[PDB]
Structure formats: structure tokens, C-alpha cells
């Protein structure tokens, strides 16, 4: 497991600067051919409840304790939704990074519907409440009397089972569950995300992290298999413009994956993309027609 | 002759001799419009295949801006580089003041209708320049269009725009003026200027976004989704029916029998690039010889209707590009059932290009998308025919057998035109042929 | 009111007059209106009913939000059989809200912080309990016998339609005391005033003058198209109706410069333009009228993911006089009649609406912005963004700033008139009274409930909808272009993206709105501003300068941008 990824991504969004992400990605040594990194969106190891850090090799070492948000949850497992103060746009961004960054991603149960936690139950039990299936008694987890439950379901006005459950979210395709489901559906359609190369594109704007995943044409083909994909993520909460240099894919047509929309073809001049606060785009770089 | 500058005239996209294997290709004319301009009418002779004559308004000296130099610098004549004047603002201004005069120079006479041309506005060149023309937009008030492949006039994109607006039919961008010459014997129309539908959008681009709607986040019915094009399709129906009925008033009508032997020659030649189309051929021929010795009504028509040649503005649909597509054969009248066949043909292509782009987009259950596409394709075709029939008393589906024939013919021409150019398309014509 | 032989009538000079604001005849073109019910906003006397003095206390919030003018629906003494649009006494505020003095206290307190107040005023009809009508029926030969339209048969004006065709069987109702029929366009207990009687015209002009003397900033004249009735016509928009409105304008311009007259006319844009008056004089009737079909079009435009239903009505709206200004709000129905405006001929979306499942569900019911868009935050922002950037002066409805919901089962108009949700405390912090006493119950569902949706909760995080909405008004007030600038639609190749430019001759601003739920690219042609630098307003971020080539902007689903076009140095 690549443990310090999440703490860096977190602090990167805090600073509205791409570099805390860029740094650990640059400082990660290459791994064997069989090998694969594992990444998840949490700050602590469930075994020891310790956040990984190296006094020498981590330049963010002293930085974390000084951040008020980081300081509050030291030694406690928290879910994705509470970690980002229930900001839907952020939840999407962090999920979008998890699925597009190198290595195999791990989702934690209930994060797909944006469940919360109950910190007072214990530093590790906090994230181990019952899965909230319906707004029925015991959140549809058990028929037993509420006293018998191994842990109580979330009951607050924000993350409560009356307002946050699977049954509720199944209907509108705008829900976080359905959004999360579809993002996995898109990711499974391009191998580039899973086992492709990773080249960071940089850019002039420090708040925007742009990179390309790529898989080579094994004995020939031009499908969603042997793709080049482009990911542009905006870490700032305000709208940001970025001028990217995609000259290598001159003539190629970027196609946004969630809508299959064709964007203007890439040229010699810098390509301009504009994102909203904590927004992101996933483009399939498609060949020009012979 | 031409010399190196020739190379540029083969990089075009509007140049059709990419496959034609040329013999001597030489400049046929050069009138002088201004000190630094000349309306050159080049002529290209091929070996085995008819001659084709292009035009190019070439300027000398310096040819700005910097953001067009690639798509403009024709070459270098002693001793400043030559470039086509559609990319110069000082030059297109003159070429519009010449249409306004309305002037003449040696052979090329310019004419304008009893309207008002709009000079003293900034002009840029439009991006999607077509395989028969190039276009520059003066401000947001008028758009000039010089025909890059002039063939001996009269040109229907000018002819049919005039009578349509003189009648007052609202579904055509109004014509302002034009210009022509008399090279050798017959005349040649060279270009038109017209009232700009600023704030427009293509039909294909608009159907593509509705076909995008069902398909993405699908399995929710074709009528229930918000993207539903059905209402807009119905409006487009009475739009095409309006121009047809209005055209028939001035053009007049005649009675003629279904071109059995002519359309048999089309289906016979299509079998040259044969697929499983030969297996359908007897069943298709049975549909053809069923309507033999039957009379239809022939009007002047568009000739090449598809969602691309149709624009949407606020307060109305617009019909453009009366190309139409042998200039003699192009002007010949025809059953309006050919035009409604073209639009209905185009609906299936809009829905299934997406399904190919949704086979893109593989693998497990494209069967769902096909179910939605068939839903969408058949529903907007219905909505379109309904709107057409609402405008003129006649319903196209009421005389279905005549329409079903032309749909089948448009598929045979679609198969051959696609198969040669693009192999991946072939399932679309073949499957739709199987559907009908 | 009272009676002796005539119905006596209080004097403006017996109450004071609130602090006058400096005279400005264009304030309404720059203002952002905030429609707030007196009964709903805040209760200070623990009776369970919102009151004038409570509304006075909460003016600091209103000021903080950044709205410029309060719009109060009718608060006059009334039997309230038709939500208070049936007025019993024009010179008396309904007991439960307070005294006329309490209204002056509100005015003065509001003017002190630059906030203006306008009010609904029904012109066409009074309640059947109004002293006038009781005098007309009881004393037919008295001085009020001809104050209402009486008849011996229910035959007259047969061309006029029954507005409430499901409740009323006729527009003539038989009075048992007078033994005659009386005309009423609305309900049988809301008899129409006879505007052919000169005394009636003078009486109503004195009602206007009363509240204007107290120092009110303007009125919204309700049900004005139905004032005059003539044979052989549908009794709508008759010349004499407009002629009376011209008098009201003259009375405003002559006696109280800088006041406003809004016209509630629920008709197609091409018709309501007549209510601004003769365009030669630059307007001589109403200052404002409402562009009613904007919201239904914006709504259907987002449904289709196509810009054109918005473009169409903007293109088909006729030009208005120089003084005049359009009024726009984000609702589908007129609060008076609960009817969505439509013209069978001139609306091309006519048949389209009933076929839409979402539109079909709320026919005849007032709904708030949040429920109308299924609580989609991104949409709520888009619709708000359009409201503030489109031509005309916008009206916000109370509680929409925090994304309150509605309770449809309370009634087709009461649905949006629940108490304002201030805190998650008992009664949503609206009143101290026991929950049973409340005039209407607060929202209690898991989504729009006062436990989860209230002002107190949203004040803290600047990411909240309240704070977002507040700031958008703060940005809008910093550029005049939005208020009174020109409007040129830029078009673009992508049908899902609506882009346009507002301009004053001193900003040019660019608004790009994406109606599609998926991310969309648009290539705009901004050659006219070559060299200019677009600056995004919410972040003061400079974008790349505009060139000769098409400018590319990429938006997320239901996103939008607001750029200030700034000169090169
Ligand atoms: Ca009346």
C-alpha cells in the first residue's frame, strides 16, 4: 500500500497547489513487473492507527500537525464524506483521483453513498457502523431490536440513516451512489487507468494537476483497450484555467468519457481547459480518421 | 503551367481529383479585380474521367494574419508570396464592395438583389469549409461564399434561394447578391452572399445530443427522457413541407412514372461492390417491380436533404445547401418522397453512429442501446412525417410504397458510397436495408 | 373604515411618515426584489402568526443578504377566504400583523438601511365584506349603489371567460339582499369594482395616495387587466383599462417622484408590452411588468439540454420603453390565478409542457426552486445564475436562498408559504408559541426539514447555499451591465451552451451557461473584444486574452462562468 498518498492529496487540496501530490509521485521508486501499488483514501493504518510519515524524507512532516483539519482527526479513522466536510464536489474529486492515479484502488464500504462516522464509538470502530440500506428501523441492517445491534447506526441530521441510505439513492441518477457506480463503469472501459504509464503534464497554473495514462498497441488495435487518456483535476475551490501542452497528440480528438462528447482537436498551440472549483475532466485521446 | 502552386490546389479537401489521375492541368482564366488580386479560374484535366474547373481569388504581397499562414500561402511568384484572398480582410472588403456597386470586371460581372449589403464590418473565415465551397462571415450580418468548384451554371444554391424568399417562405437564409462569369461558351456562377444566421446550430449536431441523452444513462424509455427530439422533429417536418409546397407553386408540377429501369441501373451497379446485398437484391427487386407502371408527382426539390443541410435559428428551421446532387440532372424535377427519404435516412445514421460510438464503448450489453436506438429512430421519423403531413394535406406515409422504394434506393447509394470510402459504415446501410 | 352615510376613511396625516429616501427614478432597474410574506417571516408576539414587528426585527438579515427591495403580498384587513387577495379594508392592516403604525415603523427602519418596500394591491375587486359592497347591497340608491357592477340578468359580457372554471359556474352571482346579480371575474365573494363610476376611480386613487403619503416605495397592481368590462369583448386589456393606469402613473410622477408601479399581467410578452404605455413618451403607464414565461422556458431548456427554448422567447420579446424594466422570477405560476401563462398560437412549446412528466406533476401548484429542481444544488446555482444575469430586475422568493422546500398538501398557494426556517430549534426559530398555534407548520421531512435546512446552520460555512447566494448578489451589484446593460446572445456551435454578453457604455460582461448535465465545450467568437482579458468575477482570476481564433471554454454539467471583459493596458 502506498500509504502517504491520501495525506498528500488532502493537503494538496488544502493548499490549492498540485505539488504535494506531484512530490510523492516523483519520489516513489519504480516497482517490479508483477508488482502493483495499492491506494486508498484514508490517512491512518487500521492496524496501528498511525499516519505514515518519515521525519527526513517527508517534506510535509511538520506541516500536518499545523493544519487544523488534520490535527482534529489524529489517530482516528474517518470516512471520506466527513473528512471532506460532506462537500459533494470534493468527494467526487478525491474519488476521481483515486480511480485515475497509478495502482489498484480500494473503496471502503458505505463511502459510495457518502455515509458518515461516529467518532465516540472508538478510534477504529468509528468507521464500522452498520451499512445503511434503507430508512427503515436499524437502517435495514437487521430485524433485531435496536439494543441488540453490535453498533448503532448513524442518527444525526447529516449522515443519518433517515437521510443517507442505499434505497434512497438508487432512484435518481444524480445520486452519489449512481455517480460512483458509473465512474467505476468508465474506469473498467479503459485499461490505461489500471496498468498504463503515468506522465504528469504540469502546466502553468499551480492549482491544476494534469496527467496522461497510456497503454501501447499490443500486436495492433484502436479500441478502448489501447488508449491514451487525459485527466485534468482542479485542486482549487475557485474556477481555474489551464493551458496544457499536448503537441504530441496533435490532430487527436479529446472525447469526454462520461458524456462521449468530442472536444476541439489538439493543435500546436497550448490547449486551454477551464474547470470549476474542485472539478475534473476525463478525456479519451482518440486518433484522427485515416 | 501552374507550377508548384499546383501542389497547393491538391491539398484542399475541396479538391476531388485526389484519386482521378490527372493529365495536363492548367489555368483557364485570370481576370484582374484589383492591383493585388486576380479571380483565377483553374481547370484540371484527368485521364479517364471528365474535366473539372475550380476557382481561386489569388492575392500577392503579404498575406496575414499569422494564424492562417499555413492554410493560405499558395506559393511565391517573383517576388512576393501569393495567397488566396479569403484570408485577407482588406481583400474580402473589396470583393464585397464590388458585389455592392454592383460592378463588373472584364468578364466577371457582380450582381446584388434589391436589398442592402453590410460592409464596414470585421470579417473572419468560417472553420468548416466544404468540399464545394469556402465561407467568410462579415460581422453578424452577412456571409460570403465563393464556390471552389465552379461547373457551368445556373447554380441551384442561388436559384432556389431566390424564388423561395421572393415568395416569402421563412425557411431560407435570405440571399443578398452573387457573381458570375462567361468562360468560353456557357456561363459559370462563382459565388453568393447571404444573410447570416448568426446563432445557429446544425440538425445533425442537435439530434446527436438527443441521441446522446437516451443512450447515456439509458434504459429509461425514449418518450420519458428529457432529451426527446420528437417535438423538434415535428417542427422540422412542416418546415420541409412548407418549402416543398411553396416550391411546387412557382416551379410547377408534372406527372411521371417511377424510374424503374433507371433505379434498376442504380441497384445493378451497386452490386458491383457486392456484400450480402446480393441476397436482399431479389427481395428488393420485388419491391421495385411492384411499383412499375405507376405515376408520381414531380416538383423541383432540394435533392440532397439530410440533418447536416438543415439549421436551427431562434424562431425557425432553415434549409441550406441546395447543392443539390451532372448539372443538367441536378436541376431535373423529382418526387418529394426522395427528400423525406433523405431526412428519415439521416435520422437512423444519427442514432447508430452513436451506437457505433457506443460500440466504442464496448462490450457486454450494446443490445440495450440498439433497443433505444430503434425506439428513437422510429419515433422521430414518425414525428417528422406527422409534421410534414400536418402542413400539406398529403401524407408521405399514406403513399408508403413510393417512399419505401426511395428509402431502399438511398440505402443502396449509401452502401456503395460508404463501402468504398469507409468499411466500418457497411453494417449501417446493410442492417437498415434488412430493417426495411 | 366605519360609516355614517358615506364609508368614512382614516387620514394619512394621523400616522407619521417614514424617513424618505433620496429621490431616484431608476432604483427599480438596479434593484433585486425579495418577496416575503409578513405572516411567514418572523413572529414576535408568540401568537404563532408572523407580524410586522417581527419582520422589522429581521431587517438586519435582509440587509446582510443584500436585497434592495422587499415585496410584501397583501396584508390588509381581510376575511382571508382567498389568501388575503380579497381585501375588506384598504386603510387597515390585518389585526394579527399589527397596526398601520407598525407598518410605518417597518418602513422607517427599512429606509434607514436603504431597503425599499413595495406591496401587492388588488385593484379589480374587493371582498364582499368590504363596507362599500355592504352599502351597495343594502342601500342601492345610496352613494355606493353604483360602486359594483349590478344587473337584473346573468347574461351580460357573455364573451368573458370564467377564470376559475371549476369553482364558479358563472361570473354573475345573485345577491339576496339587493335581489340582483353582481359581476366578479374571480370568486363569488370577490365582487368586481365598477370602474365606469367616476367616484370609484377617485376612491382607488385615494387608496394609492394613502400608502404613498405614509411613504411606501411602490405597488404591484394586481388583476388590472380585468378592471373595465365592455360588450362584444372578452373584457380583458380594454383601452379604458389602460387609460386609468395612465392616471395612476401621472399621479405618481406628479406627486411622488421616484416611486414605482408594477403590473401583474399574466399574459404573453407581446401583450403585456402595452402596459408600459405609449412608447413615444417613453412610458406613461406601469414602470415594470412581469416576463412570466421565462421560467417555464428556462426549465424546459435544461430538460432538453438545448438553449433554444430560452433564446426563442428572448428573441420574440418586443422592445419596451426607456423608463420601463422587465421583472423576472423563477416560478411557473402566477400567485393570483395559479395559472401558467401560455398562448396557443404564439407559444411553440404550447403542447410540449403537458407532455413533460415533471411539468405535468406540478400543474396549478406553487413550488419552490429547490423542489422544482429536485434539490440538485448544481441546478439551483445555474437557475439562480441565469436569473441574476438575464435582462430585467430579478425577484427572489423568501427561503429560496437557503434552499427551503414546500408542503404541497397545505394548498396550491400555501405550499410555498410555510414559516421561514431560522434555526433547528422548536418551530424552526419562527415563534415561541406552542406548535399547534402556528399559522402553518414548518417543513419536517428528512430533506427540506428545519432540522437540516435553516439559516443558522448555513451562516458558518462559506460553501453553503445561503452564503453562495449572498455573494452572487454581491457580484451582481458590482456590475451595472447585469441590471441595465444591453443583451447580445453569442450563440455558439454547441446547442447545449447558452452564451451572451451584457454591456454598458462601464463594463462588458460575458456569461456562459451550460444547460446540459454533462460537461460541454463551446467555441465562442469574441473577435470584437480582441486583446481584452476575461476575468472571472467570483475569483478575480485572469484568463487568457481573447484573440482572432474562436475562444474555447469548457464547463461541467450545469455549470456556468461570469467573466468581466477587461481592457488591455
Ligand atoms: Ca372589473
Numbering used by the authors:
A (entry chain D): 298 to 587
B (entry chain L): 1 to 325, 329 to 439
C (entry chain C): 9 to 513, 523 to 586
Sentences copied from the publication:
In the same study, we showed that TreS, which interconverts trehalose and maltose, forms a noncovalent complex in vitro and in vivo with maltokinase (Pep2), the second enzyme in the GlgE pathway. Pep2 catalyzes phosphate transfer from ATP to maltose, yielding maltose 1-phosphate, which is subsequently polymerized by GlgE into α(1→4)-linked glucan. The Pep2 structure shows the prototypical two-lobe architecture of phosphotransferase enzymes of PFAM family PF01636. The nucleotide-binding site resides in the N-terminal lobe, whereas maltose binds opposite to the nucleotide in a pocket of the C-terminal lobe.
Crystals of the M. tuberculosis complex failed to provide useful diffraction patterns, whereas diffraction data could be obtained with crystals of the orthologues from M. smegmatis, diffracting to a resolution of 3.6 Å. The core of the assembly is the previously reported TreS tetramer. In the hetero-octameric TreS:Pep2 complex, pairs of Pep2 monomers straddle across the β-sandwich domains of the TreS tetramer in a clamp-like fashion. We refer to this assembly as the 4 + 4 complex, which measures ∼175 Å in its long dimension, ∼125 Å across, and ∼90 Å in depth. The asymmetric unit (ASU) of the crystal lattice contains two copies of the TreS:Pep2 complex (complexes 1 and 2), which display differences in terms of subunit orientation and level of disorder. The footprint of a single Pep2 subunit covers surface areas belonging to two TreS protomers, including and extending beyond the C-terminal β-sandwich domain(s). The binding interface is dominated by van der Waals and hydrophobic contacts, corresponding to ∼70% of surface area buried in the interface per Pep2 monomer. Within the complex, the active sites of TreS and Pep2 are both open to solvent and do not face each other, suggesting that following release from TreS, maltose needs to diffuse through solvent on the way to the active site of Pep2. Second, the complex structure demonstrates that the ATP-binding site shares structural elements with the TreS:Pep2 interface. Given calculated masses of 272,000 Da for the TreS tetramer and 48,800 Da for the Msm Pep2 monomer, and considering that Msm Pep2 elutes predominantly as a monomeric species from the size-exclusion resin, the data strongly suggest that the sedimenting complex is the TreS tetramer binding two copies of Pep2, which is a “4 + 2” complex.
